[PDB]
Amino acid sequence: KKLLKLLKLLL
Amino acid sequence: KKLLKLLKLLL
Amino acid sequence: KKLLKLLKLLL
Amino acid sequence: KKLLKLLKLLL
Amino acid sequence: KKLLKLLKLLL
Amino acid sequence: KKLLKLLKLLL
Amino acid sequence: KKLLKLLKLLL
Amino acid sequence: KKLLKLLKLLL
Amino acid sequence: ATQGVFTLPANTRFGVTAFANSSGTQTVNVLVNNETAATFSGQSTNNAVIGTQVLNSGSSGKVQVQVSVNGRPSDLVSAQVILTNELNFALVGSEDGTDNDYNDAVVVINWPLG
Amino acid sequence: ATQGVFTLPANTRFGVTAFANSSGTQTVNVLVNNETAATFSGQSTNNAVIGTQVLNSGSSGKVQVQVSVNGRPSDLVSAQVILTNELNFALVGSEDGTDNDYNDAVVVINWPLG
Amino acid sequence: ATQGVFTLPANTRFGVTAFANSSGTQTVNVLVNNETAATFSGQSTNNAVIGTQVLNSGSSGKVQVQVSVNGRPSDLVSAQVILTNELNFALVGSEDGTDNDYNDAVVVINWPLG
Amino acid sequence: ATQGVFTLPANTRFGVTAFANSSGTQTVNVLVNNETAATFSGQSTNNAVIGTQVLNSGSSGKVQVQVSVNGRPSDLVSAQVILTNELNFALVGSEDGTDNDYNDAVVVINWPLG
Amino acid sequence: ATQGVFTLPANTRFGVTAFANSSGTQTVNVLVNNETAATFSGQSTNNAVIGTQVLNSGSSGKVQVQVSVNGRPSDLVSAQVILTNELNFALVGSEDGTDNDYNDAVVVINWPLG
Amino acid sequence: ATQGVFTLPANTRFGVTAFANSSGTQTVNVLVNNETAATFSGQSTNNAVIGTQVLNSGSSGKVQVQVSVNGRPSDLVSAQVILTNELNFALVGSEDGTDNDYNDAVVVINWPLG
Amino acid sequence: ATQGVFTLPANTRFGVTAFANSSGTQTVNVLVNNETAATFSGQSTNNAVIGTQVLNSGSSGKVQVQVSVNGRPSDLVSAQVILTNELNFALVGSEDGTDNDYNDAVVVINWPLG
Amino acid sequence: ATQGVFTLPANTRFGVTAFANSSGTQTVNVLVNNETAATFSGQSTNNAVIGTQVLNSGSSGKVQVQVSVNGRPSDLVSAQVILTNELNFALVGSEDGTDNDYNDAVVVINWPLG
Ligand SMILES: [Ca+2]
Ligand SMILES: [Ca+2]
Ligand SMILES: [Ca+2]
Ligand SMILES: [Ca+2]
Ligand SMILES: [Ca+2]
Ligand SMILES: [Ca+2]
Ligand SMILES: [Ca+2]
Ligand SMILES: [Ca+2]
Ligand SMILES: [Ca+2]
Ligand SMILES: [Ca+2]
Ligand SMILES: [Ca+2]
Ligand SMILES: [Ca+2]
Ligand SMILES: [Ca+2]
Ligand SMILES: [Ca+2]
Ligand SMILES: [Ca+2]
Ligand SMILES: [Ca+2]
């Protein structure tokens, strides 16, 4: 995953 | 059945 | 075997 | 191609 | 009739 | 019988 | 194991 | 077998 | 030809069971070694069991079934059938009148038992 | 070969009777037109009748006998015999074990009735 | 009871075979729809085949076996047996004398064919 | 269940006759006392006799019929029937394929002879 | 041995894809927990994809592939292979006829996804 | 060890199908005789088919699968599996990142076809 | 489907090894060109090697594994797997009873050797 | 990708067998719980078994095979294959040199046992 997608999941 | 042999005895 | 008719004739 | 069923039907 | 045999005889 | 077959194996 | 198969059937 | 290594050492 | 006579193996238990399908009261006599061993009597037009017993064929193995209705012997048909060379049926039908359905008393002998 | 399946004349009453000769409890199912029409259950080593019943062969005439012990199907043997071209017996034996006496449940079908 | 009469499916081919076991010449007549369809004649004390043929059961399926020796009718015994609800045997024995072996002419009818 | 095995009276002559109704060549083996006593082979779709023979049941009386087609055992069905407690037929049908007419080789054993 | 049945990890997405190589129309049924979860149907002799889908293995993880042609079940061959202890392939071949190429419907299951 | 290389029978048609499971666009190259015979490209995290096609294995039968993402070669794992000595699968997984699920492009080669 | 038959490259040495996991004595026959080339027999419930051997695939390359217990053939499962396009495993499992663990005799064939 | 690592069911008995095909002495280490559970050492160019043993898969089921020759790790290839959803093979090949036959130590893991 891209970091933007990872940050969407985490946040 | 017994009808026919009764009838033969009778008649 | 059929003998009696013939044996009867014998007698 | 179901040749056995075809053979059964024709013969 | 054993069509398996005929068929392989076929082909 | 249920058990006589087991007995046959054991004996 | 033959012995075990019959034991399972019985019990 | 390491024969290549041996041949390289010898020759 | 004689009907209703069967040679069983000696000293062997067998079942004998009789069914009735007639207006007339059926009397079934089962003889072993030429001596009466069981007698059944009853009346049914719905195949009721008028008797079922276990007998022993004895030393001779000879078994004979006779059927009477009001003292008059019925006409018998019979055969023996063996399945897988071990399971035996001796079968009897009987006719007490004129319609020739031969079910008026039906007798089934089976062996082995147990 | 299939066993225990019989084609009767259509719409005909028949008798079915089951005898038991086994330590195991016998369950006899009688199907007509592939639907259960009678069930018999019982235990005997002395040829006891565990069920007898009058059924109708229906439009199909198809009668099938099944036998099981504790849910396990028994191996069947069967045949049909006809005496004087009119008296019919459909015969079934069954084996639930290893001695192959084939009497563990014995089923007899007879027709005609009445 | 009548013997040697069998109801086959109509217009169906069947085999008929006759064996002889007697000093006397056997005459076997096979009737279909009450008319003679085949006659076998021969003599044997070793079970020789005195006739074997394929016939058609005709419009009614009615097949009748008659046996005579020098014009005298023999006494008949018969039955039909069906295996796995499809394989049919119609069996006839006959007695021309006094020993009651009922093998003097033996007739086997079988169907289906093919 | 085992099929095609019959216990005859010991030391007794019997007839064995086989008919064929199949595209496949039928091989019929007749064993007496567990040893081959006769082999018939032939092909017919019209109930031709492929073999008839007189044999002796021997000291044990055990007679077994086997049928194969091209080395493959056929599935067998069998029964024995006894008429007037004297006349015996041992009957075998066999299936070599899928249509289950069980007539592909038909074997009839009969006794007594003479 | 049973073929076409695979135990997957529970509650896991998997892919299922079917290819056809046969004149016959292939019907591929995919069962999860013994209930149909997907069905593919098509015809191709050139390995066309007749269906591809994402499914969930559910609480049981039991996945079964069935293949039939006009209602007749095809013979299946199958195996599971795991690469680098993580990548899973459940593979199915099927034979609808007599040439035994076992490619008539080819089914591939793969997991994990994502 | 080398991965993604398979020796097929020469000049033989085979299927090749690629599935994608990654955020990255996958590029699958299939080489035959060391030259590009097909290229598939696509992106999916739901196992979508990014290409399926029939190819020919060429004069040596040598087939090679290569996978790249953003021009970077993915790490490959592979194996060949043969069912019933006839049905061949050549299987490739690939990893484009760090999670080591090896599904980022999945490639399935199958033969024979037809 | 046929199991336990593998086509190897001709005239190639291969290893064959059999493990036992059963109360029954396992007999493993390895045929090359349809002729027995090796036979292993032994009994173990702890995966003992009952035989290992180096054979040559010969002119045909045909290798077949058979397994029997008490003279009864076991049900077989098999597949071939190839790693890095060169290392070959031909795998066989077998079931001699009812529990379906298919490990009663396990046979692993591997090539190349040396 | 990592090779030679397999997840077995936990605390489960499995077989491990190592074959040698190299001039170099092979050392095979089998790790359970990331600890050496067995070590096999030997030399063969004829596929000799250098070790066979039953191990336990331990608390996580993680089993790792390592191969080295004179202290140098060999390059590994591996896969797991499952037949009839029950019988498991975990397969390892290894290369100690330059010819890339990957047979120098061959390791077969199988389960279930018993
Ligand atoms: Ca009456
Ligand atoms: Ca009546
Ligand atoms: Ca019994
Ligand atoms: Ca009993
Ligand atoms: Ca006489
Ligand atoms: Ca006589
Ligand atoms: Ca047939
Ligand atoms: Ca036929
Ligand atoms: Ca096919
Ligand atoms: Ca095909
Ligand atoms: Ca990834
Ligand atoms: Ca991924
Ligand atoms: Ca087992
Ligand atoms: Ca086992
Ligand atoms: Ca090497
Ligand atoms: Ca080597």
Residue numbers in the entry:
A (entry chain M), B (entry chain I), C (entry chain K), D (entry chain N), E (entry chain L), F (entry chain J), ...: 2 to 12
I (entry chain A), J (entry chain B), K (entry chain C), L (entry chain D), M (entry chain F), N (entry chain E), ...: 1 to 114
Q: What did the authors write?
A:
Herein we report the first X-ray crystal structures of mixed chirality α-helices in short peptides comprising only natural residues as the example of a stapled bicyclic and a linear membrane disruptive amphiphilic antimicrobial peptide (AMP) containing seven l- and four d-residues, as complexes of fucosylated analogs with the bacterial lectin LecB. The mixed chirality α-helices are superimposable onto the homochiral α-helices and form under similar conditions as shown by CD spectra and MD simulations but non-hemolytic and resistant to proteolysis. To get a direct insight into the structure of AMBP bp65/bp69 and their linear analogs ln65/ln69, we performed several crystallization studies using either the compounds themselves or their racemates to be crystallized as pure compounds, or their fucosylated derivatives of both mirror image peptides as complexes with the P. aeruginosa lectin LecB. While previous reports of similar mixed chirality AMPs concluded on either unordered conformations or helical conformations appearing in a membrane environment based on deconvolution of FTIR spectra, here we reported X-ray crystallographic evidence of short mixed chirality helices consisting of only natural residues existing as helix bundles within the protein environment of a lectin and almost perfectly superimposable with their parent homochiral α-helices. These direct observations unequivocally demonstrate that the α-helical fold with only natural residues can sometimes tolerate multiple stereochemical inversions without significant conformational changes.
The LecB complex with the homochiral sequence Fln65 showed eight crystallographically distinct structures, which represented amphiphilic α-helices. The same was true across the ten different X-ray structures of linear α-helices observed in the X-ray structures of LecB complexes for the homochiral Fln65 and its mixed chirality analog Fdln69 (RMSD < 0.9 Å). This comparison showed that the helical geometries of the homochiral and heterochiral helices were not significantly different from each other. In the case of bp65, bp71 and Fln65 the peptides were aggregated in bundles of four of more helices via hydrophobic contacts between leucine side chains. A closer analysis of the different X-ray structures showed that the peptides did not make any significant contact with LecB apart from the anchoring fucose residue. Indeed, bp65 showed a CD (circular dichroism) spectrum typical for an α-helical AMP, with a transition from an unordered conformation in water to an α-helical conformation upon addition of up to 20% v/v trifluoroethanol (TFE) or in the presence of 5 mM n-dodecylphosphocholine (DPC) micelles mimicking the membrane environment.
